[PDB]
Amino acid sequence: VSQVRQNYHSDCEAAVNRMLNLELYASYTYSSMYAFFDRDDVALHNVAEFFKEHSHEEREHAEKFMKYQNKRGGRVVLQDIKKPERDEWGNTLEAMQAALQLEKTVNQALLDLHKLATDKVDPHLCDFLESEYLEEQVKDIKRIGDFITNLKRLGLPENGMGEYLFDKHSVKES
Amino acid sequence: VSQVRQNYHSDCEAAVNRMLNLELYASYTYSSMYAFFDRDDVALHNVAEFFKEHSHEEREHAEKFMKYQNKRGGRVVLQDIKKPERDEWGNTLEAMQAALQLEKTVNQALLDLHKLATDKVDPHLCDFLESEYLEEQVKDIKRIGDFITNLKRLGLPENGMGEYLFDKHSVKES
Amino acid sequence: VSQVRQNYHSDCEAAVNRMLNLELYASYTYSSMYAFFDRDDVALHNVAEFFKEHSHEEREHAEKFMKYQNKRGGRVVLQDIKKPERDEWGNTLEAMQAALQLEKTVNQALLDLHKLATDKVDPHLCDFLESEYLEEQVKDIKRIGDFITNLKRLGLPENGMGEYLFDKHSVKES
Amino acid sequence: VSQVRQNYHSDCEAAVNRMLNLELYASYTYSSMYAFFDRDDVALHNVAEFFKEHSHEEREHAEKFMKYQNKRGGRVVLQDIKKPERDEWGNTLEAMQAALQLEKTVNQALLDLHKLATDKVDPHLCDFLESEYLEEQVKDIKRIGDFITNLKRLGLPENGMGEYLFDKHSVKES
Ligand SMILES: [Cl-]
Ligand SMILES: [Cl-]
Ligand SMILES: [Cl-]
Ligand SMILES: [Cl-]
Ligand SMILES: [Cl-]
Ligand SMILES: [Cl-]
Ligand SMILES: [Cl-]
Ligand SMILES: [Cl-]
Ligand SMILES: [Cl-]
Ligand SMILES: [Cl-]
Ligand SMILES: [Cl-]
Ligand SMILES: [Cl-]
Ligand SMILES: [Cl-]
Ligand SMILES: [Cl-]
Ligand SMILES: [Cl-]
Ligand SMILES: [Cl-]
Ligand SMILES: [Cl-]
Ligand SMILES: [Cl-]
Ligand SMILES: [Cl-]
Ligand SMILES: [Cl-]
Ligand SMILES: [Cl-]
Ligand SMILES: [Cl-]
Ligand SMILES: [Mg+2]
Ligand SMILES: [Mg+2]
Ligand SMILES: [Mg+2]
Ligand SMILES: [Mg+2]
Ligand SMILES: [Mg+2]
Ligand SMILES: [Mg+2]
Ligand SMILES: [Mg+2]
Ligand SMILES: [Mg+2]
Ligand SMILES: [Mg+2]
Ligand SMILES: [Mg+2]
Ligand SMILES: [Mg+2]
Ligand SMILES: [Mg+2]
Ligand SMILES: [Mg+2]
Ligand SMILES: [Mg+2]
Ligand SMILES: [Mg+2]
Ligand SMILES: [Mg+2]
Ligand SMILES: [Mg+2]
Ligand SMILES: [Mg+2]
Ligand SMILES: [Mg+2]
Ligand SMILES: [Mg+2]
Ligand SMILES: [Mg+2]
Ligand SMILES: [Mg+2]
Ligand SMILES: [Mg+2]
Ligand SMILES: [Mg+2]
Ligand SMILES: [Mg+2]
Ligand SMILES: [Mg+2]
Ligand SMILES: [Mg+2]
Ligand SMILES: [Mg+2]
Ligand SMILES: [Mg+2]
Ligand SMILES: [Mg+2]
Ligand SMILES: [Mg+2]
């Protein structure tokens, strides 16, 4: 074992690798959403940029797991990054509903990791998750829910004008 | 009696305490409106912030009555702050209608205090009310009426797009 | 249930509402202390301002619970804010003793919430309490104890000069 | 009658002259207090300066009545300025007690003027009194009461150290 390794269970090391992969998968989904909203036949550029930003965020959170792994004396083991579940994302509402689900999936995986770290009496891992991931996740889930509520209010999916307006007012100008 | 007390009727002292309480009650109502518009299933953040600002305003106006009481040599006597009448506030129109009523209630209480101060020949109290409260109240009532007129124009309660637009254009960006 | 809700027990939601109320109650107590020290027959203005500051602090901490509730997909439910237990607060020593008790009461309620969150396996709630409340509480309790020790040293309640000096040196000039 | 005169009762004109005189009398009292605290055998220089400031304040308020008189088309009629009631003022407590009485005397005269202006249906005079005099008077009376309370707390008249400390901490350094 690594000369730095202390209080780091094999199960947690493996779960960190899995979480790394899931963050990369989430990044890739968001990248697909970006490309969809950039299409000439979709053309919601602020929406697209929102998803691009989130893709980069998730990639950063993957990298933070790699650094963590090494700091603890675990070993990074990479797996294929699965393509997103869809090739096209319907409209802003459908995309945001998918983003909500994705965020909740990532959140559940983080909560499960936290429970494993608790059961293996690893406070450093618990703190890392709490300090670097769990709050930012609650905030992302809240913001996407807020957005879904507004898209419904605006009459999505039918109300194109509502869709247009969301891109102008709800997401930052890009 | 207090060494500072001069020309300060017991009835006015008690009415000041009641007015203190009513301002605290109004503050609390507005806080409830803030929390409602912050809900993920409501999600009108500029509306929410409007109500938060008004809550803080009313709390400041309560504090000013406490300072006044003491300046005159009266004694602050606090009562429970009653919870708001509703737990949920429907939509922006219903909330603004409730705010209009609340403001008119506060205004009537201020006008009644003014009439008591007049009848007890207390010009200092009359000036305080005129200089610190009555105009700001007229302005708040006007602005909320203006808002109701615009919400109706926008098609509330049915027209969600209208609601969305009000939050973007009528209330300050928060 | 709310579309954002994940890993948020009904018991914790209700306990958050109760904690909201307790922070509002604590705010109101401190406001009463402010008004007492502002009286012409008390006239310890730096003491008064200390308590005013703490009132505003507690009101901010209530607001943070409202935001938290909504972020988790819980629902803010407000109750009456009970008036303080006393109308008058004796002197600086008695007031600080009451403040110590109040802070310890708030602290116990936060610790009980933390234990509930632990038992319901809610790390986000645990982190929120630890990061936003528990340390600031330890520091407030320490500072008030320090103050009690100094008030005793200064000869309170009998030694008026000691009281006068505490207001000049121990609390910030306001 | 003066070409500017409109809605200005002879009784109010005369009462303004009397009020002018009373402000000059109050100024002169405060000047006497200044000189007393400046004595080598009294030697409370911040106390002395407090009273000097108040003397100048009262002289300014006299001048404002002269300007008012002329603005309304009344005629300034001056009378002797009576010397203060005492030649020596005991100590800081006795002086502040005398100042409280003086301020309350001036306040009663202003309130009586206000009642005369009301009965003669002179809103301009009423506003002048409310806007320029009545609030500043409430504040002066409060501050002097606060001071008396602190002087008692400090053990006046017996406690010389208490007196010394009041001059250092309660009144501005001069
Ligand atoms: Cl290893
Ligand atoms: Cl290990
Ligand atoms: Cl292991
Ligand atoms: Cl597809
Ligand atoms: Cl975080
Ligand atoms: Cl009284
Ligand atoms: Cl009275
Ligand atoms: Cl009375
Ligand atoms: Cl309701
Ligand atoms: Cl006003
Ligand atoms: Cl829910
Ligand atoms: Cl849940
Ligand atoms: Cl539950
Ligand atoms: Cl009591
Ligand atoms: Cl903290
Ligand atoms: Cl000192
Ligand atoms: Cl000092
Ligand atoms: Cl004339
Ligand atoms: Cl005339
Ligand atoms: Cl006449
Ligand atoms: Cl004499
Ligand atoms: Cl004034
Ligand atoms: Mg080795
Ligand atoms: Mg292993
Ligand atoms: Mg495949
Ligand atoms: Mg954090
Ligand atoms: Mg984030
Ligand atoms: Mg996220
Ligand atoms: Mg995240
Ligand atoms: Mg007394
Ligand atoms: Mg009474
Ligand atoms: Mg009730
Ligand atoms: Mg005005
Ligand atoms: Mg206002
Ligand atoms: Mg108002
Ligand atoms: Mg108002
Ligand atoms: Mg729903
Ligand atoms: Mg429940
Ligand atoms: Mg009760
Ligand atoms: Mg634990
Ligand atoms: Mg932590
Ligand atoms: Mg901390
Ligand atoms: Mg604190
Ligand atoms: Mg505290
Ligand atoms: Mg605290
Ligand atoms: Mg002429
Ligand atoms: Mg005449
Ligand atoms: Mg004579
Ligand atoms: Mg008037
Ligand atoms: Mg004024
Ligand atoms: Mg003045
Ligand atoms: Mg004065
Ligand atoms: Mg004056």
DSSP classification of residue D82: P
The residue ranges of every structural domain in chain B are 1-174
Q: Looking at the complex, does the CB of residue C72 fall below 8 Å from at least one CB of chain A?
A: yes
Least CB-CB distance to B4: which of D111, D126, D142? D142
B49 in a labelled binding site: no
Q: Looking at the complex, does the CB of residue B31 fall below 8 Å from at least one CB of chain C?
A: yes
Neighbouring C-alpha atoms within 13 Å toward the C-beta of D18? 13
CB A51 within 8 A of CB A174: no
Question: Which two tokens mark D152?
Answer: 């008692």
- Cβ distance A138 to C71 less than 8 Å, yes or no, reads yes
Q: How far apart are CA A60 and CA A54, in angstroms?
A: 10
Enumerate the residues of chain B whose CB falls inside 8 A of the CB of residue C34: 66
Angle (nearest 5°) at CA D4 between D3 and D5? 95
Single-letter code of the amino acid located at B91: N
Q: How far apart are CA A46 and CA B34, in angstroms?
A: 28
**Residue A2 exposed, middle or buried by CB count within 10 Å (0-12, 13-18, 19+):** exposed
B23 in a labelled binding site: yes
Q: Which residues of B123-162 are buried (b: 16+ CB within 10 A; e: fewer)?
A: bbbbbbbeeebbeebeebbeebeebbebbeebebeebbbb
Q: Looking at the complex, does the CB of residue A155 fall below 8 Å from at least one CB of chain B?
A: yes
Residues with CB under 5 A from ligand 44 (ion): C 103, 140
Q: How far apart are CA D4 and CA C165, in angstroms?
A: 57
Q: Mapping DSSP to helix (H, G, I), strand (E, B) and coil, where does residue C77 land?
A: coil
Question: Which two tokens mark D9?
Answer: 């009762």
Q: How far apart are CA B166 and CA B149, in angstroms?
A: 11
Bridge-partner residues for C81, per DSSP? Answer: B81
Least CB-CB distance to D134: which of B2, B4, B127? B127
Q: Looking at the complex, does the CB of residue B173 fall below 8 Å from at least one CB of chain A?
A: no
CA B160: distance to chain centroid? 27
Q: How far apart are CA C150 and CA C163, in angstroms?
A: 10
Q: How far apart are CA D149 and CA A18, in angstroms?
A: 71
Q: How far is the CA of D104 from the centre of ligand 30 (A)?
A: 15
- Against chain B, the chains showing at least 3 CB pairs within 8 Å are A, C, D
CA B10: distance to chain centroid? 25
Enumerate the residues of chain A whose CB falls inside 8 A of the CB of residue C6: 104, 107-108, 111, 141
CB C12 within 8 A of CB C122: yes
- Cβ distance A134 to C121 less than 8 Å, yes or no, reads no
CA separation (Å) from C121 to A76, A139, A142, C125? 28, 19, 20, 9
D101 in a labelled binding site: no
CATH class of B1-174: mainly alpha
Least CB-CB distance to A153: which of B40, B163, B168? B163
Angle (nearest 5°) at CA B145 between C81 and B42? 55
Bridge-partner residues for B81, per DSSP? Answer: C81
Sequence-separated (6 or more) residues with CB below 8 Å from residue B149: none
Sequence-separated (6 or more) residues with CB below 8 Å from residue A109: A18, A19, A22
CB B129 within 8 A of CB B114: yes
- Tokens 């509930």 belong to which residue? C116
CA A170: distance to chain centroid? 20
CB count within 10 Å of CB C33 equals 27
Residues with CB under 5 A from ligand 4 (ion): A 86-88
Residue of A146, A168, A172 to mutate when probing chain B, most B C-beta within 10 A: A146
- Cβ distance D134 to B123 less than 8 Å, yes or no, reads yes
- Angle, helix D160-169 to helix D135-153, in steps of 10 degrees: 140
Q: Looking at the complex, does the CB of residue A139 fall below 8 Å from at least one CB of chain B?
A: no
CA separation (Å) from B126 to A65, B7, C60? 67, 12, 33
Q: Looking at the complex, does the CB of residue D82 fall below 8 Å from at least one CB of chain C?
A: no
Q: How far apart are CA A125 and CA A19, in angstroms?
A: 13
B58 in a labelled binding site: yes
CA separation (Å) from A82 to A22, A36, A78, A86, D157? 9, 18, 12, 11, 88
CB count within 10 Å of CB A125 equals 24
DSSP classification of residue B149: H
Neighbouring C-alpha atoms within 13 Å toward the C-beta of A82? 9
Angle (nearest 5°) at CA B58 between C100 and C29? 15
CB C22 within 8 A of CB C80: no
**Greatest alpha-carbon span in chain C:** 61
CB count within 10 Å of CB C71 equals 21
Sequence-separated (6 or more) residues with CB below 8 Å from residue A103: A137, A140, A141, A144
Q: How far apart are CA B96 and CA D1, in angstroms?
A: 56
Q: Looking at the complex, does the CB of residue C42 fall below 8 Å from at least one CB of chain D?
A: yes
- Cβ distance B164 to A155 less than 8 Å, yes or no, reads no
- Cβ distance C165 to D161 less than 8 Å, yes or no, reads no
Rg (chain D; Cα; Å): 18
- Tokens 């300007």 belong to which residue? D67
Single-letter code of the amino acid located at B33: M
Give me the total of CB pairs closer than 8 Å, taking one residue from chain A and one from chain B: 34
Q: Alpha helices of chain C — where are they, by DSSP H?
A: 10-37, 45-72, 92-119, 123-129, 135-153, 160-169
- Tokens 């709800």 belong to which residue? A170
**Euclidean distance between the first and the last CA atom of chain B, given in angstroms as a whole number:** 48
**Residue D109 exposed, middle or buried by CB count within 10 Å (0-12, 13-18, 19+):** middle
Rg (chain C; Cα; Å): 18
Enumerate the residues of chain B whose CB falls inside 8 A of the CB of residue A165: 161, 164-165
Enumerate the residues of chain B whose CB falls inside 8 A of the CB of residue A96: none
Q: How far apart are CA B21 and CA D122, in angstroms?
A: 35
Sequence-separated (6 or more) residues with CB below 8 Å from residue A10: none
CA separation (Å) from D52 to B50, D33, D38, D40, D99? 48, 8, 10, 17, 12
CA-nearest of D64, D149, D75, D70 to D110 is D64
CB B113 within 8 A of CB B19: yes
Is chain A adjacent to chain D, meaning 3+ CB pairs within 8 angstroms?
Answer: no
Find the closest chain C residue to A123 by CA distance: C123
- Against chain C, the chains showing at least 3 CB pairs within 8 Å are A, B, D
CB C49 within 8 A of CB C174: yes
CA-nearest of D103, D119, D113, D89 to D15 is D113
Strands (E), B21-94: none
D122 in a labelled binding site: no
CB count within 10 Å of CB A103 equals 24
